[model samples]
Target: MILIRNVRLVDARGERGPADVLIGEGRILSLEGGEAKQVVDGTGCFLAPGFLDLHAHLREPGEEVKEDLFSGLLAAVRGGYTDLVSMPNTKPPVDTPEAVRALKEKAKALGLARLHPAAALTEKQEGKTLTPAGLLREAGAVLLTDDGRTNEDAGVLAAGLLMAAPLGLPVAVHAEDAGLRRNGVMNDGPLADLLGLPGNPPEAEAARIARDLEVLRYALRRSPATPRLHVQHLSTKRGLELVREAKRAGLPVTAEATPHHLTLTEEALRTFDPLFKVAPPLRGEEDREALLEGLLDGTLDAIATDHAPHTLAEKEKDLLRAPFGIPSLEVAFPLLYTELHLKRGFPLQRLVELFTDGPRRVLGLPPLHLEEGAEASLVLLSPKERPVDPSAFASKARYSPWAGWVLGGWPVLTLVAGRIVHEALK
Candidate 1:
């Protein structure tokens, strides 16, 4: 057993002031008065339930050159995530039950962050036929999504959702109208005009979200099972409003906003650097505030990183040619803690809920209690601020838009079921 003394314990249940905690054999042994193999003085740290990310891209199997399972999970633990719902938009796509099983075993062997494989919603994500949702769930798929591509066909999405309902899997949408977003590189605005780049309108996200909500309504009406719809990486204010209205009207829908959307904006695209080039291209400051408002008001459920990583070579290409992604698994919590909680004065409980409870609820995972006998899958973050250094990241891709930006809440200690996967007490 290891005794961690003098820390503020935070979790979904909220903060329980300073206490000494003893953990061993993958469970919290006691809150006090326990024999220990080791003891650490964790003074001034917030010991909280580890985080979960519903939208992280781990380029493995076929695209390991950019990131393999090891680097991805290492980065995940470094970012304070105990569980991750990896996107199905990998090189070959996670469409088969065997593929799901194989990946699960591989990630398990690593013994790092928990990997909840998300199977592709459609066969090969072709938008023509649905995958075997029932078998995928049986093989341990936590959800269904065609994350890299837009949910182009309405019929396919409705069918996927209907099929996933009885199986209890949520269908996650990419939430962009392909036709409207066609060949566009940056947000549709005068800035695009000045830069002479193709304009990707914010309406593309709202347009698809509106259509998906309608699909949810139709699917819910057809089936008593009540399928769940998850809108991913919401980029526009109008999209949040639509999700808010859908929730208010009793639609079985949930939504997640990306850190990119919540923090960066179209202003970053002015640099013409491909690092700022992401799908559903970052929107105006007004949209950013709307997303924050959505989070505060419970309209948006969780904060997803959408932590897509690409090779430096891919990102070094011109803005129009480079792949749309950002390696952020290692920077998400710190960025938000610095931006949302300390700087903006947002409640720490709300932020913790977004990371720990909100995402789990979205995935239908059982709530993790922060108490004696609970699993010691936890993270202790020090409030000391520091600048982001992507070069030192555990993720293979050494790049970040937030590089050099000082942020707080960096995890000094991370444990997964009593094993210290990452620790930087220095």
Candidate 2:
């Protein structure tokens, strides 16, 4: 038994009082104080349901040097994420039931976070043949996607969506046209021009999203298939608008915005730094504001870190030579909570929802309400401002775009099923 005293309760419903919360037998025992084996002083913090990352790259099966199950799990809990969907874009893609089972076993046995394996949509992620979706789901894949490999084949994507519908699996897509992007590094604009780097046009993302949504509509009309199209890592204004219109027309489409895209912009590319580089690269300020509007108006369903980590050497290379990604498990929430909730005055509860119930809904999971009798999978968030130090991170990828930036809303303590996984009580 354990007791967290004087902590405010927060969830999708909203914020509650600064009171004691009791825990025992893997669930919240009570909302008020009671006898317990241990007590944690939870003053000056908000206790909310543990965050869930809808998209993250846990490079394993081949790229263990970048990140294996151990390091990735630690990173997840440190970010207050109790659950995460590992993208299936590894050295050997997780497109088989055996691979899914193995990944789950490794994640569960290794450590902290609940790692949900996202199986690839096509066999070997070749974008030609379909993977065994039914077997993959039976093996415990919560979603399906090629992830790092863009699903450029509309026929393949539509087929995957149809096969996933009856099984209730969401087919997530990394929306961007490869040809249109033309090996561009940063978002297409004056910045890329000034930096002398190839431009990855926002239209590349918007065009793909537009096509994917249309494919979704066509696929759904062909059968009694349910709505299960999910656009991953949306970073452009027009891309978001496409998602908004899809939702309005009542298409079964969902979308996510990454922390980097929501906060930073192409301006960071001015330094010619690869740390700020990411697929569907961070957009112009106008597009960023549109993303904010999407979050506030409920157009965007969830906030995913898309925590794609690269080797230090890989990230340290010149902009053109470096890989496109950002390792950000440690500060994903703080970046958003500070930039969106605190500074921008976005409602805290809404922000919390994007991290909590919103993604759960996309994955077809049950709601995790902060109430008595619910599982105590939650975190204690501190509002203290401090710079982001990559050295303190549990993830293998030590560098981050948020490095040295002072921010609040850091998770001081984290738990899953009432068992403490991480604690920094101070």
Candidate 3:
């Protein structure tokens, strides 16, 4: 058994006294007094449950050149995430039970982060036909989505939701009206016009979200048996407002906003850096304010790292040809804690919930707690401020818009099921 002592324990129940945690085999054995094998001086450190990410692309079993299961989990470990759900938009889409099984097997062998595989709602995510949802569930998918593309066919999507509903699983939708967002490079405003690029109006996200809300209503009336709908990578103010209204109306819906949406804007695209090219593209300053409001008012469910990684060589090309993704996993917690918690006045408890409690609830996993007998999975954070250096990041992809930005509260140690998976010695 491994024992960790003299640590401040933080969990869904809130922070508790300095305590000892013990781990035996693969589970937390107990939280009892013991001679410390490793006595970390919690001192000023905050020991909280290891984080969970509902949206992360681990390009494994196919696009390992970008990020494999091993590399992706290593990034997750350093970032203090013990659990993460992988998107289905891989080389051979994770639409089949076979594909889902393959990822699960590989992740088990890696034994880093627990991989919750997301299955494509449509066959190969084509959006016209239905995937074998039942088969995917039996194969062990917690949710379904065509994350890279919206399931544009309303009728087909409604059908898929109805099929997935009875299984009590969620359909994570990438809400974007392709027609409205065609040739769009960034938010439509002075920025896009000045940069000479076609713009994606904030209305594009609202338009699809409005349709998706209607879709949820139809599913409720026709097949209320399903659990609910989920909005991924929400960017617009109107989108957050709609979700707030839906929640008030008691719709079985939840939404997540990335750090980029909560902090950055389309103005970042003025430099023609593809590093800022992301779907549901960055919005105006007003939209950023609305997202922060959503997080404060409890409309937004979680803060996720939509950490899509691409090589610098690929991102250096013409903006249009460059891929739409940014590497944020390595810096997600530090950046969010600095921007949202310390600076923006968001409560640390709420911020912790977004990382620990919120995503776990969405995934139907056991809530992490710091009480006696609870699991010892935890993260130790160093709240000192430091500038982000891309050369210092742990991700395989070295590109990050957050590079050189001063940030605070970095995770120094990450423990998964009581095993110290990551530690920053320097």
Candidate 4:
């Protein structure tokens, strides 16, 4: 048994008092005062339901060099996340029930954050034929996606929607047209031109999203069941508008924007460093402002880290040859809390919702709250300002664009299933 006292409670419902909470046997036994074997003073901090990430690349099963289940979960808990949905863009790709089961078993053995494996939408992510959706779901795949690549075939995406709707599963799309992108490296703008680098036009993302929304519209009309589509790492204003109009028309669609997309801009590439490179590369200031507006107005559903990590050797390649990704599982929360909440004046409660309720709602998980009888998954955060040092990260990837930036609202303690998984309580 443990008692946590004098912590502000923040959740989907709203913010409440600096209450004392009691936990026993992996459950929140009570919210009021009670006797416990252990006690922790949570002075001048807020306690919220553990955060959730809808999209992250764990790189396990084959590419453990970048990140495995153990190291990835450690980074997640350190970032205040208790639940994470792992993307299936692995070496072999998690396309089989056997693969799904193995990944789950490995994560279970770690006994850290809850890792939900998202199987490939197509067999081996070839984007030609669909995987056995039913079998994958039965094996514990929370969703289906060809994450690293867009399934450009309209027929295949439509068929996938049809198969997933009745199963209550969602299809997460990468939302980029490879044909339009034409092997481009960075965002198409004066910045790319100045650097003499190949550019990936924002239209590539908007065009793909527009076409997918049309397919989703057709899928809704043709089938009695409504299929859910989740657009991952949205980076354009045009893409945001398309998703917004679809929601207004009553389509079952949700979207996420990453911390990098929300915070950084294309100008970061001026250094000629590959660390700033990512899929649907960072856009102009206008687009960045539009993404922030979308989040404020509820057009964007969640804030995912898209925590893609690569070896130093891989990331050190030239801009055109370097792989696209950012290892951000450790710094996601502080980055957002500082930029969005403290600097931009966004409400702290809403920021908490983006990490907690928003992602859970996307995954069809139950709403989390600070109440009696709930699962004891929680995080204690301190708003004390500090500088970010990538060297202190638990993730295997050591590079970060936010390194040396002063930030606040860092997680001091993290608990999963009533167990103290991480603690910096001092």
Candidate 5:
């Protein structure tokens, strides 16, 4: 048994006393006084349920040069995430039941963060024919997505929605229209024109979302079972407006915004730094504000890192030639905590919900509460501002756009199923 003392408990039920938490046999034994074999002082810290990431790209089974399973899991634990849903856009792509089972087995053996695989929506992610949704679900695929590429075929997308609905799986869309993107690299505006780079218009994302919502509506009308549609890494104001409308009408739709999209803007591209480049490229301030408002108003369901990591060599290329990604697992919480809570005055509890309860609900997991008998997956956070250093990261991808930024709410200790996974609590 292990005892954690003097920590403020924060969860969906709201904040509670700075009391002791007892753990044993992979579960929280109690939150009151108890005796234990080991004890850790959690002074001046907040003990909360471990975070869940619904859209992280752990480039495993292929592209290990960028990020492998072990490195990704380590990075996740350091960031206080106990569960991660990896996107299936790898080299071989997780399209088969065998692949899904193998990935889950490997993750289990690691004994690190719980890794849930999201299988490809189409065979090879070609966006043509659908993969067997029922087979994938049975194999333990928590979600289905053709991330990193938008399935441009309306009929095929509708088919996937209807197919996954009966199987009780949610389908996540990348939400970009290739025709409108036109081989563009960054947001289309004065910045792109001035830099002489091809532009990706904001309308590209909004149009695709509008079309997909219609497809979801059609699927719901045709099937007795309701299919879930999740929009990934929303970046534009108009795109969020579409999502807000769908949610208002009570369509079974949920959307996620990334830390980068909420904090940075196209202006970051003025330096021509490839690190700031991302798919559905960062937009103007108006778009960022809209995303923030959506999150606050519950129009957006969660905040996902979309933690796409690329090798340094790939990221070092010029802006136009560089890959669209950011190695951000270790810095997500601190960056958001500093920017949204400390700087912007957003409520700390709401921000915690975005990282905890929000993603859990989206992935169909039971709601997390820091109560007795709950799983002992938790994090101890110290709300002291500190600088982000890429050299300290466990991830193989060392580059980060957030490097050198000062942030608060860093995780000091992480526990998974009553076992210590990462600790810096000295």
Candidate 6:
């Protein structure tokens, strides 16, 4: 049993308070001042709910050579995430019921952070036909998606969404059309033309999101009880506009932005480093500003790492051929805290909501906060400035856009379900 006293608690209800939390046998015992075996001083920290990442690729079941579930969860834990949704883009895509069950059971046994498997929307993510959503859902799939592949076929995607709706599972769409983004190496603009690189116009993502919205509307109108549509890693100004308008229409549409999308732009690619290469390639300054606005005003629902870890060698290839992801889990929170929350004046509470309440609501889980009787999935953060060293990151892949960029804030202690998983050096 443990007691965390003198701590400032940030709960899902947007409440902050100074209180003590007690825990025993994995459940939060109470906050009624019970005697504890150990007490932690939380004088200058905020004890918020452990974060949840709606999109992260743990690369288990096959990509273990790059990163297994254990290593990935370690990255998640160190990043203050207690729940993460694993993408199904493994070597053998998790399109079958057995695979889905296996992955979820593995996560449960680890007991580090909760893992929800997202089954591939298409078999092998080939995008020609839909996978067996019914069987996968029965095996415990919380959402369905083809992480890296955009299911360009409208009919097939609509069917997947319809199938998920009836099963009470949401469909997370990777809003890009392969036809439009094919062979593109970066964002289309003056920068791309100047660098002589073929770029994917932001319209590729925006247009596809609009198309998905249309499909979602058609499905909901047809069934009148369709499940919500969740957009993954949305990056364009137009995409945010679509989501904002949908919210006004009271449609069940939710969207997430990556830390890079909200912070960095295509100019980061000026040096042609493949490390910055990613799908729905990073956008321009205007797009970044718009994404921040969406986040501030509540159009963007969550901030996900899309924690795709590729080995250094993998990312060393030419920008066009290298893996399409960058390591982010470890530095996501600190970077956001420094750039947006502290420096740019975005509300810290809203940022926490993106990492906590927003993700919980999207995943159909009970909301969490630091309160009496609330489970002790908590993070102790320090708003201290420090340089980001890639060599010091916990992930097997240490690549990051924040590499060499100094950021403020640190998670001093991370308690998952009352068990301390990470304790910073005193």
Q: Per-residue lDDT for 78-123 in model 1, tens only?
A: 9999899888887799999999998899889999999998999998
| Candidate 6 Cα misplacement greater than 4 A, ranges | 29-33
Candidate 3: residue 337 Cα off by (Å): 0.7
Predictions in order: lDDT: 0.89, 0.91, 0.84, 0.91, 0.90, 0.84
Task: Report model 4's TM-score to 2 decimal places.
Answer: 0.98
Lowest summed lDDT over 10 consecutive residues: which window, candidate 1? 31-40
lDDT of 3 by residue, 1-426 (tens): 566566666665566656766655645566665654565555666778889999999887678888878889889988889988999889988999999999899888887888889999887788888899898899989999998887789998888789988987799999989888887978887888889999988788899998989898889988849566889999998999999999999988999989788889988887898989988798989999988888878898888888898788998999989988877888899998898888977777788888888888776677886655667677888767888887776677876888888987888888887777898833
- State the lDDT of candidate 2 residue by residue for 1-426, as single tens digits: 789899898999999989899988999989978998799888888999999999999898899989988899899999999999999999889999999999999888876999898999999899999999999999999999998889888888988888988999999998989989889888888888888888999999999999998998887888686859988999988998899999999999999999999999999888888898888798999999999999998999999999999888999998888898988888999989999988999999999999999999999999898999999899989989999999888899988888999999999999899888999877
- lDDT over C-alpha atoms for residue 204 of model 1: 83
Per-residue lDDT over 309-350 for candidate 5, one digit per residue giving the tens place of the 0 to 100 score: 999899989887889987788888889889998899987778
In candidate 4, which residue pairs get closer than 3 Å at backbone N, Cα or C atoms, i.e. clash?
none
Show where candidate 3 strays beyond 4 Å.
1-6, 18-33
> Model 2: what TM-score?
0.98
CA displacement after TM-score superposition, residue 136 of candidate 6 (Å): 1.2
**Model 5 Cα displacement at 227 (Å)?**
0.7
lDDT of 3: 0.84
Model 1 has an lDDT value of 0.89
Q: Write the per-residue lDDT of candidate 6 for residues 184-227, one digit (tens) a residue.
A: 88999899999999989888888899898889887887764656
> What's model 5's lDDT at 230?
94
lDDT of 3 at 134: 91
Q: Deviation in angstroms for 296 in model 4? A: 1.4
